[PDB]
Amino acid sequence: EDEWVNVGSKFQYKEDHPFEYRKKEGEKIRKKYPDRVPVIVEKAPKARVPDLDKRKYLVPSDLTVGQFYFLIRKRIHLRPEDALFFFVNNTIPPTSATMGQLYEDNHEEDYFLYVAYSDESV
Numbered sequence: 001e002d003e004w005v006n007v008g009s010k011f012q013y014k015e016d017h018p019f020e021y022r023k024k025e026g027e028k029i030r031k032k033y034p035d036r037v038p039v040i041v042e043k044a045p046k047a048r049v050p051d052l053d054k055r056k057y058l059v060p061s062d063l064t065v066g067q068f069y070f071l072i073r074k075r076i077h078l079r080p081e082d083a084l085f086f087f088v089n090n091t092i093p094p095t096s097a098t099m100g101q102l103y104e105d106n107h108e109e110d111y112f113l114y115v116a117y118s119d120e121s122v
Helices: 021-034 066-075 097-105
Strands: 036-043 056-060 085-087 111-120
Touching: 036 097, 066 085, 066 097, 097 111
Parallel strands: 036 111
Antiparallel strands: 036 056, 085 111
């Protein structure tokens, strides 16, 4: 109302595409797909992990953060031994939480959820 404004670290999608442009496609999606969530997934700067082929994702609102984590690992083509960690607003999100709950708490003003991944906790 009285609702917190979420500011995150520097994402590349947040360098390529002015806020007025990022915003626009944001409200366009949530009206076209109310049951799903727009998520931007990028590699952390110093992280030693393979870069993601595609970084724009439409995720079901009732899918857990943990399930999306295993989904990304399969896309990064990590093996069963590799370490990977999500950072949403520079904090590691709970696995039990749903992507809908995570979006509602950590979406920026452009109606985009930003998830960063690394092999360490920075």
